[PDB]
Write an enzyme that holds these catalytic residues in place. Structure first.
Site, PDB file in Angstrom:
ATOM      1  N   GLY C  29      -0.287  -6.895  -1.213  1.00  0.00           N
ATOM      2  CA  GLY C  29      -0.533  -6.121  -2.431  1.00  0.00           C
ATOM      3  C   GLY C  29       0.607  -5.212  -2.853  1.00  0.00           C
ATOM      4  N   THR C  30       0.432  -4.561  -4.001  1.00  0.00           N
ATOM      5  CA  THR C  30       1.446  -3.658  -4.550  1.00  0.00           C
ATOM      6  C   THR C  30       1.520  -2.371  -3.729  1.00  0.00           C
ATOM      7  OG1 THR C  30      -0.072  -2.590  -6.136  1.00  0.00           O
ATOM      8  CG2 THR C  30       1.108  -4.555  -6.899  1.00  0.00           C
ATOM      9  N   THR C  31       2.613  -1.629  -3.888  1.00  0.00           N
ATOM     10  CA  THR C  31       2.842  -0.413  -3.108  1.00  0.00           C
ATOM     11  C   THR C  31       2.047   0.769  -3.666  1.00  0.00           C
ATOM     12  OG1 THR C  31       5.117  -1.192  -2.728  1.00  0.00           O
ATOM     13  CG2 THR C  31       4.600   1.067  -2.051  1.00  0.00           C
ATOM     14  N   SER C  74      -4.201  -0.522  -1.843  1.00  0.00           N
ATOM     15  CA  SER C  74      -3.376  -1.719  -1.976  1.00  0.00           C
ATOM     16  C   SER C  74      -4.091  -2.896  -1.327  1.00  0.00           C
ATOM     17  CB  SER C  74      -2.025  -1.509  -1.297  1.00  0.00           C
ATOM     18  OG  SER C  74      -1.322  -0.431  -1.888  1.00  0.00           O
TER      19      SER C  74
END
Ligand SMILES: *[C@@](C)(CO)[C@](*)(O)[C@H](Cc1ccccc1)NC(=O)[C@H](Cc1ccc(OC)cc1)NC(=O)[C@H](C)NC(=O)CN1CCOCC1
Ligand SMILES: [Mg+2]
Lengths: 244, 240, 243, 231, 195, 212, 235, 250
Positions: C29-31, C74
């Protein structure tokens, strides 16, 4: 989820057989032989205890023969623990019928209901069937003296003489040979013991490895008596017929 | 509660559990139904590997659902009791609400519905039983014979057989039964039924059961000697 | 083997492979980050602009629990939303019975027990999110990070997602250089920088910055989103540092 | 492979294969397009038929006077989810006398789809939805995926060959966004967008399906001779 | 509902039941049969709350008929009466109890003896040579105490019954529109058409 | 209400009034108290109005489902018993219904069943139900014979409702006549008491208690 | 084994797709819609000559204005018909009107996907639902176990479906009379049936606004079979 | 969520064996030896206290348990399974007997209730069998003294004397030579200590051996006086000191 670990106990084989019922019968075929013989004036129940130890308390023991009510008894072949679950249900069912109709339960009705319970375990619930076969010996005022058997499939049938458990094939051939319709109780007692004595896997048939019971009209006038044989009484009846 | 979907489709479009239940029926003792001009006759096989039986108390193969309808079967015996019981209860329930006994078509439709429900209900297997349901509707003299099977389909038959070696006796009935002229009397109908079972059975002793149903709740089971007379008569005509 | 096919099954090591597999979804996932400050906490997240067709400022990822707790995560976004829905129920029943708003450590265990419960049975799947959350209560500021296993600890700084290692390194420098403490307005600016620095590990698609904060002085102890002039000021600060 | 038997199982790389297989059912579905300006929001849907003797599967469903969606994938699943939306929109009206915000509509669908991906026995929804609506903050367009992920957009498209229409809208973004106070021109832009996803077939009178909602326009669907204007 | 009588004689059981069905100030019907055949040799008459009576009688009838089919056997009058009592004994502690009183007349084929059971809505069973429910008993019991003998014939029993109906027609306040009489013996159940 | 229906040589006559009451307030004069269940079945309504209207139209739905399932028109006995078993489930709850299920079938012939809200169900040749049932009984019983003609039977039913409509304060409005034969029910018109009373008085010479 | 409600990699439900195979094994059923009415016809297919063919009930009434024909595991259709009849009568009770043919079909199709781990498996039967209402006139619907339904001008289901459908494609036009449609069902049934077509192994039915849903007698169908043979020989 | 295991985990194999019961018996075989001997005026049950660590206080772990004032129990196999069975066995003696009849159940019937519980774990959904064999000694007015064995299957047998667990085969042989029908209680205790020394390897004293008797009534252990019919419990656990006294004259 849990689907992974399900044995699926209530399904059909490609041949149209119930796996678990077939395997339960295979289990029962290793249990101690039990014989039922029906005479004109009574019924005999004889059963062989499973390989006895000399330090087993014999007189205060019950493994094979159980009392359902004053008029009906059963001989067991299979898992004793399973049988006792079913026996207590049968004992209750008999008392419900008496409470409802003020009459002792007809033998077939009791047998059917117990057989219907076993049937249910083969069609639904996902549980293993009861690993038990019964010989029902009883009396009522409709059909008189009756012998039945039920097995894990929940199927039951009536008999003049029948065996369950181990060596039924050999036992049924011997009963079919010497049985006749005008037979008395004392003759049926002798037949039951002679059959076990020949079909037994043991070296010699002794009093300490047997359970015995009769259902006669040998009480006083038009009434039925259940006699669960004591150790000494089996010892005497074994000598009287000349087996020991 | 045990929920598992036991009866399910396969890639080729078959429900194997239903089809395997049919194999259990195929294993069962033969049963035959033949309907005449004014009667229906239900014949049943009893296997002779069982001697020392007590025929007084042993469950009979033909069961009365009501005073005017009967049900015979082939397959698992224990399963059949559950269907017979449900049918008997529905028969009394119908009399209670409609104030009229069930028609044979209705009773058949109910039993077939029960069988069907067990093919798409979770946690249960199908009934390993096919039935022959026969009788006469209230205040009606037209004979009725129906068949059901584990899948749940049902249909009416002039004559039909189920169980082991049923394809042999069906072959017999297909050429021997005339639609234009069914068995005119009771004797003719019973004889054709016994004849058809004699193609498969073995001996005509204590192996064949016959039950005759006539209009207005007139049902009777034949004894050994009565059936034996048909067996004796058929064999003497055969030697020709 | 087959020990990894079912949840709640111990391997011969003593490990639940299904939970470790859920961690891989989180790493994908994204930060997202969390910074503890003098009198509060600051949350920030990377929003990947997949297309020009995405409406700016209108796909909000940071969520509020009660009126004083902020949550960001995330991994599988829907799983994160499910967890916040529970968190809101847990906080509501606490305030219903005990009157006072739920303390942050109390709230942390409520989520912890719920996530841990999803490692006890094979009939449920573990959560596919690591959740950074916190706020201000009677005892002051708290920052927490919760993982698929149910494991959580208190943090001075926290980071998770694809650029977690980059963000962790940058966070460790702030802890060393500011032993006395970091201010709320500073932490917002630093949060922007760290997201921009952590974006180097996800630099195909350009991104949209989103920041929120709780502070006893700046936001009066309540959770608010950083918008407008304060947001653009934090973006400019981050832009100046990368160049 | 071994990790796609049910939705409760993660793969070693952290994937949910049953959710991905559900996503695959959307790609097989017929194309549908969604776009909006500041005054209106438009759905355009290519309907599919079994053969020439059959009808064309209806793609667009109304949820409220101010909201509705188009579908792509399993139609029964769209019926279940649209019915849920109808109830939620209705609950908001009866209890709070309040038109349900299009954003909350998305949040509710996300949470409903999610529960099906974490429990044994159940399955993911096998359909994608494009929700349009006009509420107190103007026009809106949402994209629902059965993974749970909901996204607000200016324009988008889902189904087979949806990449063609999605690219066109990405180019036309600056033009169609400013089509304010002009329904017919916003539809024309949507009809031209869906045309970029056509292969061998063209838009006919009983093939095209258009829906619109806006400032002074309730959610209404156009089929049959009513869409002949736009061919 | 109102008047139901029963007399057990040497070889049979005779049940008499009033024909009137009244509701408010109107006799709605004057040919009502307040009885159901439970089995070929068992008859049950009933009286009590409107609706409850027939609903209960038919419910019992269905159950006994179900038993008969299942076992291909007729339950004894004693067995049927015990079943009926238990149903009423359950009923009385229900949310809404059956307010029905019954007489069960049967011929036991195994004992070759007639049997009459009186059961009230509480589930109070008694075997009797003669029985009645409601206000009827306040006249008939004393009358039968005097005129009844245990060794009477069916014809003597009917004359004894005529004596009861005459007394009730003379001293009862309400017009009950005569009675339907039925006889239960070794040959089953039959109705006397001219009474 | 006053409703009647009687069996005779030429089938079944069914006659009802048309008044609805809310205490002493006359709620309506033009109410339909006969419901046509099917071409061979009729149902009369007396007692609580919603109770009758709701459950008798419901009864019709159950009768329709019977003939769909069984491919045969429901018997009058079975139809009446559906309704009687239903109200028995509601016994004590306070339903108020006095009904008559009238119709013809092949197996039964012309049949009338009385069903009320205490669960009473009775087959019979003559019944009068409602607040004015006694007034209707007075005229009907004293003039009834099995051998009445279709013309005379229709009139006696009409006249019996008129008698009750006159005396009973909670009956009136108009008379709705029906005739049930082997071929089904036949409607014999709405007859306003406003004109019918004076027409009957003059022609018959009856109602001498009233100022002419 | 594997879950009942599992998706395949191609994005289809295994059990639904397998139930479609069961329907292909079933006996043929054909429906044609005209402006003068909708015709429904089926292949009875008796398994043995001793079976009384008139007891084979594969065409069924739902209401006076809606009829139904089936194909596949026909035992599964009983509960579907029961639901349809109840839905139709219930709507009449609540709204004092006939229920729309589309609304009825939709109600039946809602049962379809109510299976899993509700019933244990999908239905193994397809239905052709034909009817009439005041709004959309004469209609024919094909209801599958997937929960999907299409309206058709004409449609064939069962074992001879793909061959019969191609034939219906050529023969159908918007100006067909009822008599023309009756013959067309008989013609196409005779082509795809194994055994030779007659009044005993094939059944016709129709629904018209005036007379409602009617299953034809064996005497009436026999004359239409005779009329069909003569017209084909006449050119 | 929820227990989806509604199906049997113990099923019949093609050979007719119930695998989980057999495997449970295998677990009992691995367990430490315990035994029981019946005398004319009493019953003795005994077992080794296998200590998990010398730092552990073996007094806190009780292998021999009181079920009723006249019934005691001991086991071989899995301790935790035994502990919960003792809890359930104590409760069932009250709920299904004492709360009904106002007196404690006779040995055979309590045993029967324990057997029922163990049988249900063999057939019910989502559970394994108990991994223990019990020896239950007890007294009641009408049956006198008695000794029962209960296996994982739910089967139970009465014994004059027996042993279960690790060295049960050798121990049963030893008891056959020494047992007679004229044994006094003290003689049975002596034989029990002799039989147990064979199976025990390490230390053999009152601190490593656990032993209890069902003998005469103990008024001193009752806790109150004033009711003549209440004479005290027949179950008594022998102290560490009392065992060592008998080990000197061994
Ligand atoms: C005559 C007029 C005597 O009432 C009839 O019984 C007539 C029958 C009838 C049938 C169908 C349509 C209309 C009328 N009954 C009435 O008019 C009826 C009288 C009545 C009132 C209340 C009752 O208690 C249950 C029983 C009978 N009138 C009504 O039903 C009036 C129109 N409505 C109400 O009183 C409304 N009430 C009903 C009971 O619940 C509270 C509201
Ligand atoms: Mg008036």
């Amino acid at each position: 989820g849990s689907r992974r670990y399900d044995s699926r106990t209530t399904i059909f084989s490609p041949e149209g057989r119930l796996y678990q019922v077939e395997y339960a019968l295979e289990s029962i075929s290793h249990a101690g032989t039990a014989i039922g013989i029906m005479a004109s004036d009574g019924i005999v129940l004889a059963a062989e205890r499973k390989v006895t130890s000399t330090l087993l308390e014999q007189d205060t023991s019950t493994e094979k023969l159980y009392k359902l009510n004053d008029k009906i008894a059963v001989a067991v072949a299979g898992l004793t623990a399973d049988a006792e679950i079913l026996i207590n249900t049968a004992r209750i069912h008999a008392q419900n019928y008496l409470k409802t109709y003020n009459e002792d339960i007809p033998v077939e009705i009791l047998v059917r209901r117990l057989s219907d319970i076993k049937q249910g375990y083969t069609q639904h619930g996902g549980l293993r069937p009861f690993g038990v076969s019964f010989i029902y010996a009883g009396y009522d005022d409709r059909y008189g003296y009756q012998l039945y058997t039920s097995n894990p499939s929940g199927n039951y049938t009536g008999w003049k003489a029948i065996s369950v458990g181990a060596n039924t094939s050999a036992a049924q051939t011997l009963l079919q040979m010497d049985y006749k319709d005008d037979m008395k109780v004392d003759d049926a007692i002798e037949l039951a013991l002679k059959t076990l004595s020949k079909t037994t896997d043991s070296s010699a048939l002794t009093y300490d490895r047997l359970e015995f019971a009769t259902i006669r009209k040998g009480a006083n006038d038009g009434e039925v008596y259940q006699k669960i044989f004591k150790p000494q009484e089996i010892k005497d009846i074994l000598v009287k017929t000349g087996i020991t | 509660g045990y929920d598992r979907a036991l009866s399910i489709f396969s890639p080729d479009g078959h429900i194997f559990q239903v089809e395997y239940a049919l194999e259990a029926v195929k294993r069962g003792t033969c049963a035959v139904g033949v309907k005449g001009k004014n009667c229906v006759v239900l014949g049943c096989e009893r296997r002779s590997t069982l001697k020392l039986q007590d025929t007084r108390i042993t469950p009979s193969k033909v069961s009365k659902i009501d005073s005017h309808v009967v049900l015979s079967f082939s397959g698992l015996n224990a399963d059949s009791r559950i269907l017979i019981e449900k049918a008997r209860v529905e028969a009394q329930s119908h009399r209670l609400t409609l104030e009229d006994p069930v028609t044979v078509e209705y009773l058949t439709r109910y039993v077939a519905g029960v069988q069907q429900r067990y093919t798409q209900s979770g946690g249960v297997r199908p009934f390993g039983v096919s039935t022959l349901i026969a009788g006469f509707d209230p205040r009606d003299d037209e004979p009725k014979l129906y068949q059901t099977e584990p899948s749940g389909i049902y249909s009416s038959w002039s004559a039909q057989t189920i169980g082991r070696n049923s394809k042999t006796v069906r072959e017999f009935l297909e050429k021997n039964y005339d639609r234009k002229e069914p068995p005119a009397t009771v004797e003719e109908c019973v004889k054709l039924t016994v004849r058809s079972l004699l193609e498969v059975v073995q001996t005509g002793a204590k192996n064949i059961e016959i039950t005759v149903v006539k209009p207005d709740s007139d049902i009777v089971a034949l004894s050994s000697e009565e059936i034996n007379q048909y067996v004796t008569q058929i064999e003497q005509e055969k030697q020709e | 083997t087959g020990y990894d096919l079912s949840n709640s099954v111990f391997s011969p090591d003593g490990r639940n492979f299904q939970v470790e597999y859920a961690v891989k979804a989180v790493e994908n996932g994204t930060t997202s980050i969390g910074i503890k400050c003098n009198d509060g906490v600051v949350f920030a997240v990377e929003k990947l602009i997949t297309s020009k067709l995405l409406v700016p400022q209108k796909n909000v990822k940071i969520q509020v629990v009660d009126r004083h707790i902020g949550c960001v995560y995330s991994g599988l976004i829907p799983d994160g939303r499910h967890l916040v829905n529970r968190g809101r129920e847990e906080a509501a029943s606490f305030k219903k019975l005990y009157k006072t708003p739920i303390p942050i450590p109390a709230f942390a265990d409520r989520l912890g027990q719920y996530v841990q419960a999803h490692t006890l049975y094979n009939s449920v799947r573990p959560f596919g999110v690591s959740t950074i959350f916190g706020g201000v209560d009677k005892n002051g500021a708290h920052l927490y990070m919760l993982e698929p296993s149910g494991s959580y600890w208190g943090y001075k700084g926290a980071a998770t997602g694809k650029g977690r290692q980059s963000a962790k390194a940058e966070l460790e420098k702030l802890v060393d250089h500011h032993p006395e403490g970091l201010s709320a307005r500073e932490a917002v600016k630093q949060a922007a920088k760290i997201i921009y620095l952590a974006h180097e590990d996800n630099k195909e698609k350009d991104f949209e910055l989103e920041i929120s904060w709780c502070s006893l002085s700046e936001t009066n102890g309540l959770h608010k989103f950083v918008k407008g002039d304060l947001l653009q000021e934090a973006i400019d600060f981050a832009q100046k540092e990368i160049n | 492979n071994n990790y796609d038997g049910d939705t409760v199982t993660f793969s070693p790389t952290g994937r949910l294969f049953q959710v991905e297989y559900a996503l695959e059912a959307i790609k097989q579905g017929s194309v549908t397009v969604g776009l909006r300006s500041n005054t209106h929001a438009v759905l355009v849907a290519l309907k599919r038929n079994a053969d020439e003797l059959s009808s064309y599967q209806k793609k667009i469903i109304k949820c409220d006077e101010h909201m509705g969606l188009s579908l792509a994938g399993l139609a029964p699943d769209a019926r279940v989810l649209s019915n849920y939306l109808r109830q939620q929109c209705n609950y908001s009206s009866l209890v709070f006398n309040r038109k349900l915000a299009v954003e909350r509509a998305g949040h509710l669908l996300c949470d409903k789809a999610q529960k099906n991906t974490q429990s044994y026995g159940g399955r993911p929804y096998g359909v994608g939805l494009l929700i349009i609506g006009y509420d107190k903050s103007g026009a809106h367009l949402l994209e629902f995926q059965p993974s749970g992920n909901v996204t607000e957009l200016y324009g988008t498209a889902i189904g087979a060959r949806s990449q063609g229409a999605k690219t066109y809208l990405e180019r036309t973004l600056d033009t169609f966004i400013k089509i304010d106070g002009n329904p017919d021109e916003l539809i024309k832009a949507g009809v031209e967008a869906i045309s970029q996803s056509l292969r061998d077939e063209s838009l006919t009178v009983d093939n095209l399906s258009i829906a619109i909602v806006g400032k002074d326009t309730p959610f209404t669907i156009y089929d049959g001779e009513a869409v002949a204007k736009y061919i | 509902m109102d008047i139901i009588l029963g007399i057990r004689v040497q070889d049979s059981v005779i049940l008499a039941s009033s024909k009137a069905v009244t509701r408010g100030i109107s006799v709605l019907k004057d040919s009502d049969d307040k009885t159901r055949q439970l089995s070929p040799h068992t008859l049950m008459s009933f009286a009590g709350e409107a609706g409850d009576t027939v609903q209960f009688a038919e419910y019992i009838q269905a159950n006994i008929q179900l038993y008969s089919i299942r076992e291909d056997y007729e339950l004894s009058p004693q067995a049927v009466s015990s079943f009926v009592r238990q149903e009423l004994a359950k009923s009385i502690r229900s949310r809404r109890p059956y307010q029905v009183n019954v007489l069960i007349g049967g011929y036991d084929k195994k004992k070759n003896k007639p049997e009459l059971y009186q059961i009230d809505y509480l589930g109070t069973k008694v075997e009797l040579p003669y029985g009645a429910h409601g206000y009827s008993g306040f006249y008939t019991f004393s009358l039968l105490d005097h005129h009844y003998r245990p060794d009477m014939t069916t014809e003597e029993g009917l004359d004894l019954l005529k004596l009861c109906v005459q007394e009730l027609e003379k001293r009862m306040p309400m017009d009950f529109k005569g009675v339907i009489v039925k006889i239960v013996d070794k040959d089953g159940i039959r109705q006397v058409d001219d009474f | 209400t006053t409703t009647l229906a009687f069996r005779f040589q030429g089938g079944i006559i069914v006659a009802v009034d048309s008044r609805a009451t809310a205490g002493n307030w006359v709620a309506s004069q033009t109410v339909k108290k006969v419901i046509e269940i099917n071409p061979f079945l009729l149902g009369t309504a007396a007692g609580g109005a919603a109770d009758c209207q709701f459950w008798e139209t419901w009864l019709g739905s159950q009768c329709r489902l019977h003939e769909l399932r069984e491919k045969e028109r429901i018997s009058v006995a079975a139809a009446s018993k559906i309704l009687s078993n239903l109200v028995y489930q509601y016994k004590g709850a306070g339903l108020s219904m006095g009904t008559m299920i009238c119709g013809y079938t092949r197996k039964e012939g012309p049949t009338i069943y009385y069903v009320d809200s205490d669960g009473t169900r009775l087959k019979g040749d003559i019944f009068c139900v409602g607040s004015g049932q006694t007034f209707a009984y007075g005229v009907l019983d004293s003039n009834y014979k099995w051998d009445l003609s279709v013309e005379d039977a229709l009139y006696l039913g009409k006249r019996s409702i008129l008698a009750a409509a006159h005396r009973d304060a909670y009956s009136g409005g108009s008379v709705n006549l029906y005739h049930v034969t082997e071929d089904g029910w036949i409607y014999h018109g709405n007859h306003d008491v406003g004109e019918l009373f004076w027409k009957v008085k003059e022609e018959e010479g009856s109602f001498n208690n009233v100022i002419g | 084994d594997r879950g009942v409600s599992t998706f395949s990699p191609e994005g289809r439900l295994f059990q639904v797709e397998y139930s479609l195979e069961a329907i292909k094994l079933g006996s043929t059923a054909i429906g044609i819609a005209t402006k003068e009415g909708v015709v429904l016809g089926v292949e009875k297919r008796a398994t043995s000559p001793l079976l009384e063919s008139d007891s084979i009930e594969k065409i069924v009434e739902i209401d006076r204005h809606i009829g139904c024909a089936m194909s596949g595991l026909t035992a599964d259709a009983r509960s579907m018909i029961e639901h349809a009849r109840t839905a139709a009568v219930t709507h009449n009770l609540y709204y004092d009107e006939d229920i729309n043919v589309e609304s009825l079909t939709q109600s039946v199709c809602d049962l379809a996907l109510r299976f899993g781990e509700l019933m244990s498996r999908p239905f193994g039967v397809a239905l052709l639902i034909a009817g009439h209402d005041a709004d959309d006139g004469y209609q024919l619907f094909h209801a599958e176990p997937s929960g999907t339904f299409y309206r058709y001008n004409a449609k064939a289901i069962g074992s001879g479906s793909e061959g019969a459908q191609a034939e219906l494609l050529n023969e159908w036009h918007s100006s067909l009379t009822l008599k023309e449609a009756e013959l067309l069902v008989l013609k196409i049934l005779k082509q795809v049936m194994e055994e030779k077509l007659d009044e005993n192994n094939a059944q016709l039915s129709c629904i018209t606004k005036q007379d409602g849903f009617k299953i034809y007698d064996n005497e009436k169908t026999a004359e239409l079979i005779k009329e069909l043979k003569e017209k084909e020989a006449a050119e | 969520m929820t227990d989806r295991y509604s199906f049997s985990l113990t099923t019949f194999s093609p050979s007719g064996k119930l695998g989980q019961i057999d495997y449970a018996l295998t677990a009992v075989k691995q367990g430490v030896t315990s035994l029981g001997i019946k005398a004319t005026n009493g019953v003795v049950i005994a077992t080794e206290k296998k200590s998990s660590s010398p730092l552990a206080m073996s007094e806190t772990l009780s292998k021999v348990s009181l079920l009723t004032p006249d019934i005691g129990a001991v086991y071989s196999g899995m301790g935790p399974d035994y502990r919960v069975l003792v809890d359930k066995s104590r409760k069932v003696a009250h709920t299904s007997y004492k709360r009904i009849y106002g007196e404690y159940p006779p040995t055979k019937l309590l045993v029967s209730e324990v057997a029922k519980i163990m049988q249900e774990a063999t057939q019910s959904g989502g559970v394994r069998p108990f991994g223990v064999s019990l020896l239950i000694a007890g007294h009641d007015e009408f049956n006198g003294f008695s000794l029962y064995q209960v296996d994982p299957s739910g089967s139970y047998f009465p014994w004059k004397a027996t042993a279960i667990g690790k060295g049960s085969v050798a121990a049963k042989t030893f008891l056959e030579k020494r047992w007679n029908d004229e044994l006094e209680l003290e003689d049975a205790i002596h034989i029990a200590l002799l039989t147990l020394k064979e199976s025990v390897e390490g230390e053999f004293n009152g601190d490593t051996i656990e032993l209890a008797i069902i003998g005469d009534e103990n008024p001193d252990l009752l806790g109150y006086t004033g009711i003549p019919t209440d004479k005290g419990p027949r179950f008594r656990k022998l102290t560490s000191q009392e065992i060592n006294d008998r080990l000197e004259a061994l």
